[PDB]
Amino acid sequence: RLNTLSPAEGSKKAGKRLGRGIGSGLGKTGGRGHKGQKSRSGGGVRRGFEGGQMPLYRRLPKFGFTSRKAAI
C-alpha cells in the first residue's frame, strides 16, 4: 500500500519557477518588471526607506523609558 498514500488536496502548490518559457506565465524577468533598482539582482531599499524623505521612524520623537521592575 506504500504506493497508494496521497496527501490532502491543497496541501501542495509546487512553487513558482521564474524565467521558464512564455506559456508558464511569469517568464522574462519572472514578475519583477522592466529596468529599475528593484529589478536588479540583489536590488531593493532597506527597511523604512522612503526614497530620501525623512523616514516615519525619524520624523516622530522618541518617548518614554523602560522600567526594570516590569520584567520581574
Positions touching RNA (CB under 7 A) are: 17-25, 27-30, 35-39, 44-45, 49-53
Residue 52 backbone dihedrals phi, psi, to 5 degrees: 115, -30
Rounded least distance, CB 5 to RNA, Å: 26
Residue 68 backbone dihedrals phi, psi, to 5 degrees: -70, -30
Residue 24 near residue 16, CB atoms below 8 Å? no
